[PDB]
Design a protein around this ligand. Structure first.
Ligand SMILES: CCCCCCCCCCCCCCCCCC(=O)OC[C@H](COP(=O)([O-])OCC[N+](C)(C)C)OC(=O)CCCCCCCCCCCCCCCCC
Ligand SMILES: CCCCCCCCCCCCCCCCCC(=O)OC[C@H](COP(=O)(O)OCCN)OC(=O)CCCCCCCCCCCCCCCCC
Ligand SMILES: CCCCCCCCCCCCCCCCCC(=O)OC[C@H](COP(=O)(O)OCCN)OC(=O)CCCCCCCCCCCCCCCCC
Ligand SMILES: CCCCCCCCCCCCCCCCCC(=O)OC[C@H](COP(=O)(O)OCCN)OC(=O)CCCCCCCCCCCCCCCCC
Ligand SMILES: *P(=O)(O)OCC(C)(C)[C@H](O)C(=O)NCCC(=O)NCCSC(=O)CCCCCCCCCCCCC
Ligand SMILES: CCCCCCCCCCCCO[C@@H]1O[C@H](CO)[C@@H](O[C@H]2O[C@H](CO)[C@@H](O)[C@H](O)[C@H]2O)[C@H](O)[C@H]1O
Ligand SMILES: CCCCCCCCCCCCO[C@@H]1O[C@H](CO)[C@@H](O[C@H]2O[C@H](CO)[C@@H](O)[C@H](O)[C@H]2O)[C@H](O)[C@H]1O
Ligand SMILES: CCCCCCCCCCCCO[C@@H]1O[C@H](CO)[C@@H](O[C@H]2O[C@H](CO)[C@@H](O)[C@H](O)[C@H]2O)[C@H](O)[C@H]1O
Ligand SMILES: CCCCCCCCCCCCO[C@@H]1O[C@H](CO)[C@@H](O[C@H]2O[C@H](CO)[C@@H](O)[C@H](O)[C@H]2O)[C@H](O)[C@H]1O
Ligand SMILES: CCCCCCCCCCCCO[C@@H]1O[C@H](CO)[C@@H](O[C@H]2O[C@H](CO)[C@@H](O)[C@H](O)[C@H]2O)[C@H](O)[C@H]1O
Lengths: 85, 73, 64, 670, 72, 68, 494, 98
């Protein structure tokens, strides 16, 4: 009916895979962390959440964007939104 | 009277509606309130009334055709 | 004269190009390839022109 | 039959609205659609009946308003101009109904929607079939009530509720002036029936015709969205797309044009209104061509394109060639409806996104939509031998054909306005179909490429075309957009054609410019719009595809930053209306309520008499101390005052001063 | 997948029935009944309007002129 | 009286009790509440009124000159 | 006895039966409420019988009774086309006014029914009397029952509201009394047949005008003198609000066809620009301040001020069209204002206990029957075609333009401003977003009682809009008698 | 404070770039340039200069603001926002008689 966890994960996995700032495409899992698991700077993560915002055609307020610092936290947020495509 | 359904009466909106209701008890005569009152109650009606008198019976359109003038007076 | 921020609009417009290296380069490469190459986008910009052109020449040759 | 064209759309509306529960979504759709299909067929017959045979049809049912000299009937006249309007009104209404089955399938409230559609068709029939100006006003107001009901269909959205206020009240401003204009007609001629007003028009006071013509024209701005009262038309894009295809771009907007075309036997005797009509027309064409080129919403562009074509018809009316304006009116409702139904189809495919900045590719994904909107855009720019070619290009050469300063002026103005039309037609067709994809992969991710493993059954959603109830209207309107102009050029353009020789479109021999437009106008100006369209189209394609940096240079310059925001903000007309007209009225209401009604009217009135008198009465009541010694002194005092008054023969006024002094002394405390 | 039709007309839940408050009797029989009986009677009311009288005289004056044809 | 501010300048993403109106259940209201809410005339913030009159004059001057 | 006296006795007989039924049974309040409702229906059946027999083109008063015995004060009843529709409006409203407020009273119900049954007689009399002192007698006998209706069954600010209506109406009406007493002194009687023959000197007319207009300006009411209505209508019970707007506000409108048009013509002509200046101002100011009103029931009351001004300028047009339009707009106002008061005072206040427009939003989502009728009554308040309100405004506005064009041009702005407030109120209650969040629990939609009085009132407004000749054919000949003027080739015939 | 503020400004200046430059390729080069200007100031510490560079950025975001910024369709400010908002109370009315 709505969005599924496997559907959102496949899209964000391909999003971070195509980003040259991740240390390796291999260690991107559902529970991946941006700062240390993926090794991203404080500005690369802002770019990442913008790419996630573009993928799902939603808006991430500044209050909610600061919470998104890992893949799982991103996966949960997209499913917490009944407005994602 | 009859019991009504439950309304979350906002204390802020209730005191605002109370304010609008008792507001007259606090009107004063200032230089500003007189200026607005004189404009609305005297000037505008006197201007509308003056034009009403000057143009009264000035024009008639019934059956007026080319070669006739709209002006009665 | 320059602002405290390194922002200069002349330099901003100079970089309005396709960058040589881009961290997101591969994430966006799908929009300029395949169905979205130059030819493919304008391959069918005039749908019936090809069928109509040859058909109209058949009618145009009516002298014989 | 004739009175059955009027009755059928009304009955289907009543079943769908008051009996939707019994018929359901399916039954409401069937009865609503079938009734307007039947009415459409009966109206195509009435075109052969009335127009091709020159047999006007009159039917009066009963009286509406009966007074001295006022007799206004529930009566209907069918003439050549009536059946001409009925064809676009009922063909487009029928197709938008069939279209709306697919577009509004997922919406919860279909019975209410389809009821409003039939209600609009009924009111539009009333507007063009009436015997008199006052029954035409019923359709005028009725179409306004129906546009409010359809702009605000989604009442939950506040934006929609603001935009429906705009449509309702900006059209009431025009209604005030028509009401004044109809008062003038009743005051001069005693009745506002068409036969009466037109039979007597050549003899009425020339200045009385000025008053009526100006009032008829002001009322015509609001509905035809001319520049003075046009702010509402782009806001009416809040309602669902099929509403914007029929009401906001193919029927109601034309009523202002119909009002002037019907009133041709009257406004022809005032050349003063004809200059105002003409300049009004030329302004709106460049005013709205410039705005639409800087808009980022697809619906907003197609709404500003409609107002550029409505400005064309009003220009033609003031040019005094009514058959040309009627020809444009009928031809435009075929391709403007097409572009809106085609735009509605791409909005449906791309997840209800209406922004060009997020559309790209899509040409391979929506092949029928692209070609059909290419059909529509070529007639919108009046590409040679399209339906719009014979209507728009004759307005241009007729403006130069009237060898006057005003005519050559409007030709230059309208030609420039045509240049910007070609610019925003490329913008729509390039950014939605031909440019690189600017939106998420979800619209462009197919199943031919595997992006998934365990979810291959679902979750691709790649911008597909709709179903039969969506495509069928688009195909039909495409055939009209290619051929309808050619097949009807004689009925309207002609050279000495007698289609409107029942005085439905009266041209006075003084204003005829047809023969000069055929022969006098040079070939260069006759061909000039064509070269401009072909030259600009390629220039804008290169600046959008090949050389994309240059426009970035323009908008990033402070000069172009202001020019881009000026036209994007619609000449700032919305800005100055809210700040200086709308907010001014709300301040005036507050000042009357706060400072006068709850202020000085109660202070110099009941509340000031209350607090003044209660203070006075306490002071006088404090004179009564129940001391016999002090009461005795009072009797002597009141005795002496009577003796002085009736022995000193004092003026009675001296007494009244004493009483007013005494009373006001008890008004002061302490 | 259209849903079943729903709702409570007059707020009467699907269990019980409408309870007559008291006004219904006179208002349906007396108030509305009087208007239908007034409507049927109004059809046979003779027409004593000034216009039906003034039209017939007006026709007899214009018939005395070429404006209106006379049946005689 | 609170500041007379249109609520269209409030954050649409704050934890508003009434999100549609951008309001909370207890917060004080300006006496002009009617015409300060989300259902009220819009406030356009593109440029200043004075600069707008200038640009309206430049359009008019350009169009009158073409007529000339 | 006559048939016009049966109109008066029936509501009096109903008062007696409510007072004596407890003496035959501890009786239920439902039995008191059926007596009062059956009594009002019988008056409506008599009034429909009178209208069937009525002659639409007769210059003699009809259904009169040969008194033949003269006293200092004697009741003389008659009917003319100018008054028949005012009687019918009173007899259609009073039954609905009772039904509308059927559950809302709760306490002092016999007293409430007795006051309305007494009001019906007094308001019926004021249209039936054939003297101008008798007109004044009943035009002002309604003030004691209305003081006690508001005080016993009114809202929170009832005490001040009831003091305002009584004292303003008493003060304004005592300047009418001085003018009436002067005419009786000069002519010897106030019987209409004898007074209408008499022609006053211009100076007497210009001072009789000052005193009848002061009364009517307070009772119209005009803008700077409308404070009593903003209090009276709002704090009044629902039923009292329906009577005060539909029937009492029309007493001054019908009083110009008796006290001014036929006996003070030169004064009415030379002073119309003063009337029109006031009428224009009260069209604009009332409408500007109706836009910013935050009490819904007081937004319906303010709307009435703007409409009364259109019909007041219509009665001062010296035109056949503006005079009939004035009566049509007063009949139209009687139905539509009744419905809007029923919506605001009888449906919202019943369910919320509040009148503040702050608390209402999206009511169409949970109450779709209320929003349908509410929309139709808002459109009629806005003078949309297909409703009787449009016909009255158009004819009232045309005669205003034909008399003094400029004032009718300002008065025509009512087309934009009545529309503005009517749709704005509508979009803020029915529409305007989703159901409010101030509603803790869901509200039920219209009851079969609320539906059928709203439907009845809407039905009269629309049917009469389509075929206004139901009312127009009766007024033509009788309206013809109040016009002042000659035409150079149609007059003084030999 | 002073961090999420500078990250909000970084996301904002990248949205203003895509709003004026509609083509994503071209905005990509613009996006690398605005990063360079934030990454050029990653060693500012004293609050006297830290907050000045945010205050002057806020001026350049207003100076170049778009007349019509892009809004996702279902977002506040979007086309389908609040379109069929559900009743916020689906429970039957409590049993009261009017
Ligand atoms: C001629 C006499 C004056 C005629 C206009 C009188 C205006 C009175 C306004 C009364 C209040 C209306 C409701 C206000 C609340 C609201 O939301 O407004 C919505 C609308 C305005 O909406 P808006 O344009 O502010 O909303 C913009 C925001 N979006 C795009 C999201 C919808 O109110 C009106 O339309 C008022 C009427 C304006 C008329 C403008 C043309 C005047 C021509 C004069 C010649
Ligand atoms: C959207 C509109 C929907 C309308 C739905 C209702 C349709 C009603 C149709 C009524 C048809 C009446 C036919 C009458 C034929 C004429 C005979 C006649 O004279 O009747 C008198 C009266 C006035 O009609 P008349 O004087 O003739 O006006 C001149 C135009 N023929 O004619 C009358 O009898 C009319 C009296 C009642 C009119 C209807 C009022 C309620 C509606
Ligand atoms: C906010 C406030 C309701 C609105 C007002 C009523 C409509 C307009 C009334 C004024 C004009 C009518 C009276 C003019 C009297 C006169 O003598 O004017 C003559 C003149 C044209 O003269 P001439 O060219 O000789 O006539 C044709 C000969 N073949 O006529 C003219 O040239 C008139 C001047 C041009 C008028 C153009 C429209 C002006 C609109 C103003 C705002 C209206 C709102
Ligand atoms: C009366 C006389 C005075 C009035 C007439 C003249 C009024 C001033 C006219 C100024 C015209 C300035 C054109 C500026 C072009 C521009 O800035 O962009 C317009 C349009 C905007 O589209 P955009 O939002 O940028 O989407 C990406 C597509 N480029 O960009 C496009 O759509 C690209 C297509 C147009 C590019 C060529 C424009 C040629 C203009 C001639
Ligand atoms: P990570 O935690 O490592 O770093 C994150 C930040 C940078 C927030 C650090 O915590 C940090 O060092 N903070 C200090 C912030 C500071 O004072 N300077 C950083 C740069 S702020 C800034 O605005 C830099 C200038 C940018 C100029 C361009 C932006 C505006 C362009 C105009 C609009 C777009 C074109 C139309
Ligand atoms: C529908 C509501 C409004 C209707 C009422 C308003 C009607 C307005 C009518 C204005 C014209 C009245 O009649 C007009 O008066 C002007 C003076 O003012 C005069 O106008 C005259 O001016 C010059 C002298 O200056 C004359 O040489 C010329 O012949 C004529 O144009 C004429 O007498 C007539 O053209
Ligand atoms: C043309 C100028 C005006 C023409 C004449 C109109 C005069 C009207 C003046 C009425 C003055 C108000 O009359 C007075 O109102 C106050 C309310 O404030 C009432 O006071 C009452 O209401 C208050 C409200 O808090 C309650 O405490 C309590 O029910 C009682 O004291 C008085 O019982 C009444 O006498
Ligand atoms: C459209 C307007 C129609 C008006 C019709 C006639 C209305 C009645 C006219 C007189 C009204 C009474 O007018 C009012 O009288 C009392 C006199 O004590 C004053 O009332 C007040 O005076 C001063 C204010 O100046 C106060 O400090 C004092 O507390 C209070 O008594 C007001 O100054 C005056 O506004
Ligand atoms: C010129 C003066 C002004 C005239 C205005 C018109 C006033 C009309 C008033 C109606 C007559 C009085 O109305 C009278 O109210 C009292 C209330 O105590 C009722 O009396 C009874 O009321 C209820 C009935 O259950 C009992 O609880 C109460 O104990 C008992 O007194 C009478 O049964 C009723 O007839
Ligand atoms: C506010 C208060 C305004 C003043 C109160 C109203 C005054 C009315 O009083 C007015 O006075 C003039 C003066 O002769 C009289 O008016 C008339 O009197 C007689 C008629 O009998 C005539 O001869 C006289 O020519 C005429 O003026 C009347 O007495 C009355 O019409």
């Amino acid at each position: 009916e709505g969005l599924q966890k496997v559907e959102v994960y496949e899209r964000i996995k391909s999003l971070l895979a195509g980003f040259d700032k991740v240390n390796d495409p291999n260690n991107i899992t559902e529970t991946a962390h941006f700062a240390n698991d993926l090794g991203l700077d404080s500005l690369d993560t802002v770019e990442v959440v913008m790419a996630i915002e573009e993928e799902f055609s939603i808006e991430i307020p500044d209050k909610d964007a600061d919470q998104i610092h890992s893949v799982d936290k991103a996966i949960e947020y997209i499913l917490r939104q009944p407005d994602a495509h | 009277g009859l019991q009504h359904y439950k309304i979350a009466m906002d204390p802020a909106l209730v005191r605002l509606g109370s304010m609008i209701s008792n507001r007259y008890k606090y009107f004063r005569w200032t230089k500003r309130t007189a200026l607005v009152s004189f404009m609305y109650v005297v000037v505008v009606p006197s201007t509308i009334g003056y034009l009403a008198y000057k143009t009264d019976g000035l024009w008639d359109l019934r059956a007026k055709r080319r070669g006739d003038l709209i002006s009665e007076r | 004269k320059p602002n405290i921020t390194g922002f200069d609009m002349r330099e901003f417009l100079r970089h309005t190009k396709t960058p040589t290296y881009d961290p997101w380069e591969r994430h966006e490469a799908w929009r300029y390839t395949g169905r979205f190459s130059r030819f493919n986008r304008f391959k069918g910009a005039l749908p019936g022109f090809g069928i109509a052109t040859v058909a109209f020449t058949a009618y145009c040759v009516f002298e014989h | 039959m004739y009175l059955s064209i009027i009755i059928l759309p009304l009955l289907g509306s009543v079943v769908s609205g008051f009996f939707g529960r019994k018929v359901g979504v399916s039954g409401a759709q069937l009865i609503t659609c079938s009734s307007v299909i039947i009415t459409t067929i009966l109206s195509i017959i009435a075109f052969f009946e009335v127009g091709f045979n020159n047999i006007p049809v009159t039917i009066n049912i009963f009286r509406w308003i009966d007074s001295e000299w006022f007799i206004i009937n529930w009566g209907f006249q069918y003439d050549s101009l009536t059946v001409s309007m009925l064809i676009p009104v009922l063909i487009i209404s029928s197709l938008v109904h069939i279209y709306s089955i697919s577009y509004m399938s997922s919406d919860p409230h279909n019975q209410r929607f389809f009821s409003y559609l039939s209600l609009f068709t009924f009111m539009m029939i009333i507007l063009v079939t009436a015997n008199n100006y006052l029954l035409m006003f019923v359709g005028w107001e009725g179409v306004g009530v129906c546009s409010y009901l359809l702009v605000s269909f989604w009442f939950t959205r506040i934006a929609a509720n603001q935009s429906s206020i705009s449509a309702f009240l900006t059209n009431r401003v025009g209604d005030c002036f028509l009401t004044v204009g109809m008062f003038a007609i009743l005051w001069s001629l005693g009745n506002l029936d068409y036969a009466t007003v037109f039979s007597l028009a050549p003899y009425i006071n020339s200045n009385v015709v000025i008053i009526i013509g100006i009032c008829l024209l002001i009322g015509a701005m609001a509905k035809s969205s001319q520049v003075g009262l046009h702010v509402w038309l782009p806001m009416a894009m809040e309602g669902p797309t099929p509403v914007s295809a029929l009401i906001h771009a193919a029927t109601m907007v034309t009523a202002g044009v119909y009002l002037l075309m019907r009133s041709s036997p009257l406004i022809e005797y005032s050349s003063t209104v004809l200059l105002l009509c003409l300049w009004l027309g030329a302004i709106t064409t460049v005013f709205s061509s410039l705005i639409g080129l800087f808009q980022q919403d697809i619906k907003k562009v197609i709404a500003y394109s409609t107002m550029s074509q409505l400005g064309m018809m009003v220009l033609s009316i003031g040019l005094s060639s009514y058959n040309i304006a009627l020809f444009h009116l009928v031809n435009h409702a075929f391709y403007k409806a097409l572009l809106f139904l085609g735009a509605g189809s791409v909005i449906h495919a791309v997840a209800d996104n209406q922004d060009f900045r997020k559309f790209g590719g899509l040409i391979s994904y929506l092949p029928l939509t692209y070609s059909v909107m290419l059909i529509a855009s070529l007639s919108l720019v009046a590409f040679p031998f399209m339906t719009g070619f014979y209507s728009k290009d004759f307005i241009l050469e007729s403006a130069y054909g009237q060898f006057s300063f005003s005519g050559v002026a409007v030709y230059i103005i309208a030609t420039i306005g045509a240049i910007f039309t070609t610019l925003y037609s490329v913008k729509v067709l390039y950014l939605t179909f031909l440019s690189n994809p600017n939106g998420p992969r979800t619209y462009y991710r197919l199943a031919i490429d595997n992006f998934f493993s365990a979810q291959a059954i679902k979750s691709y959603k790649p911008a597909h075309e709709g179903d039969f109830f969506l495509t069928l209207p688009l195909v039909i309107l495409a055939l009209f957009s290619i051929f309808f102009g050619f097949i009807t050029k004689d009925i309207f353009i002609g050279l000495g054609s007698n289609f409107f020789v029942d005085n439905s479109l009266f041209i006075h021999p003084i204003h005829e410019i047809m023969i000069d437009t055929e022969f006098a106008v040079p070939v260069l100006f006759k061909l000039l719009p064509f070269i401009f369209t072909i030259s600009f189209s390629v220039i804008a394609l290169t600046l959008s595809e090949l050389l994309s940096e240059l426009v970035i240079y323009f908008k990033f310059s402070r000069f172009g930053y202001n020019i881009f925001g000026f036209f994007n903000q619609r000449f700032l007309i919305e800005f100055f209306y809210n700040k200086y007209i709308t907010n001014l009225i709300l301040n005036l209401g507050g000042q009357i309520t706060k400072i006068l009604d709850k202020g000085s009217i109660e202070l110099f009135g009941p509340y000031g008499l209350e607090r003044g008198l209660v203070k006075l009465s306490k002071n006088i009541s404090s004179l009564s101390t129940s001391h016999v010694t002090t009461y005795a002194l009072y009797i002597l005092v009141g005795f002496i005052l009577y003796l002085i008054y009736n022995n000193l023969l004092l003026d009675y006024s001296y007494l009244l001063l004493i009483i007013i002094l005494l009373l006001l002394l008890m008004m002061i405390g302490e | 997948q259209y849903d079943p039709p729903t709702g409570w007309l007059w707020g009467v839940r699907p269990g019980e029935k409408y309870q007559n408050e008291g006004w219904e009797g006179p208002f349906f029989y007396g108030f509305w009944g009087s208007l239908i009986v007034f409507a049927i009677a109004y059809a046979y009311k003779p027409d004593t309007s000034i216009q039906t009288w003034a039209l017939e005289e007006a026709r007899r004056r214009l018939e005395a002129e070429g404006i209106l044809e006379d049946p005689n | 009286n609170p500041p007379r501010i249109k609520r269209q300048f409030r954050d649409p993403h704050a934890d508003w009790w009434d999100k549609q109106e951008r309001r909370n259940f207890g917060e004080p209201v300006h006496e002009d509440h009617d015409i300060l809410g989300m259902f009220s005339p819009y406030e356009y913030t593109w440029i200043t009124p004075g600069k707008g009159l200038f640009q309206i004059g430049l359009f008019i001057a350009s169009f009158l000159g073409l007529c000339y | 006895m006559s048939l016009l006296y049966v109109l008066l006795i029936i509501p009096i007989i109903g008062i007696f039966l409510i007072s004596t039924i407890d003496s035959f049974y501890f009786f239920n309040v439902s039995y008191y409420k059926k007596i009062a409702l059956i009594t009002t229906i019988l008056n409506l059946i008599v009034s429909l019988i009178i209208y069937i027999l009525f002659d639409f083109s007769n210059n003699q008063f009809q259904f009169i009774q040969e008194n033949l015995d003269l006293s200092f004060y004697d009741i003389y009843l008659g009917v003319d086309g100018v008054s028949i529709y005012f009687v019918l409006l009173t007899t259609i409203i009073m039954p609905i006014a009772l039904v509308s407020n059927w559950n809302s009273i709760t306490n002092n119900i016999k007293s409430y029914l007795i006051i309305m049954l007494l009001l019906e007689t007094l308001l019926l009399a004021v249209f039936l009397v054939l003297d101008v002192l008798l007109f004044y007698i009943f035009f002002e006998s309604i003030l004691p029952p209305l003081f006690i209706l508001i005080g016993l069954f009114g809202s929170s600010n009832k005490v001040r509201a009831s003091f305002y209506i009584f004292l303003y109406t008493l003060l304004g009406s005592l300047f009418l009394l001085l003018s009436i007493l002067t005419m009786s002194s000069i002519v010897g009687t106030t019987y209409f047949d004898v007074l209408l023959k008499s022609s006053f000197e211009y100076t007497t007319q210009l001072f009789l005008f000052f005193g009848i207009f002061i009364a009517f300006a307070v009772k119209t009411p005009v803008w700077g003198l409308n404070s009593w209505l903003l209090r009276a209508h709002v704090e009044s019970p629902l039923g009292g609000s329906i009577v005060l707007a539909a029937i009492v506000l029309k007493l001054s409108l019908y009083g110009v066809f008796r006290l001014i048009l036929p006996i003070l013509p030169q004064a009415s002509l030379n002073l119309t620009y003063i009337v029109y200046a006031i009428g224009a101002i009260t069209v604009l100011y009332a409408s500007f301040s109706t836009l910013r009103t935050v009490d819904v029931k007081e937004l319906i009351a303010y709307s009435s001020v703007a409409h009364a001004a259109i019909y007041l300028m219509g009665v001062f047009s010296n035109t056949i069209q503006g005079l009939e339009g004035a009566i049509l707009l007063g009949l139209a106002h009687g139905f539509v204002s009744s419905g809007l008061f029923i919506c605001a005072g009888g449906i919202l206040y019943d369910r919320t206990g509040t009148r503040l427009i702050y608390f209402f939003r999206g009511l169409t989502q949970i109450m779709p029957l209320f929003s349908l009728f509410f929309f139709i009554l808002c459109l009629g308040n806005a003078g949309t075609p297909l409703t009787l309100n449009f016909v009255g405004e158009f004819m009232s506005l045309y005669g205003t333009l034909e008399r003094l064009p400029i004032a009718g041009m300002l008065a025509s702005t009512s087309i934009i401003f009545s529309a503005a407030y009517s749709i704005y109120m509508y979009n803020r209650i029915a529409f305007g977003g989703s159901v409010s969040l101030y509603f803790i629990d869901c509200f039920r939609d219209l009851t079969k009682r609320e539906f059928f009085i709203l439907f009845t009132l809407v039905s009269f407004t629309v049917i009469l809009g389509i075929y206004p000749s139901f009312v127009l054919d009766g007024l033509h000949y009788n309206i013809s008698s109040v016009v002042y003027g000659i035409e150079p080739n149609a007059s003084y015939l030999t | 404070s002073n961090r999420q503020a500078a990250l909000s400004l970084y996301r904002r200046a990248l949205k203003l770039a895509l709003d004026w430059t509609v083509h994503r390729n071209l905005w990509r080069g613009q996006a690398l340039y605005i990063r360079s200007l934030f990454e050029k100031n990653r060693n500012v510490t004293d609050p006297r200069l830290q907050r000045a560079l945010l205050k002057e950025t806020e001026k350049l975001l207003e100076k170049w603001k778009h007349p019509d910024p892009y809004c996702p369709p279902t977002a506040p400010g979007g086309s389908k926002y609040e379109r069929n908002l559900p009743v916020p109370n689906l429970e039957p009315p409590p049993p009261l008689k009017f």
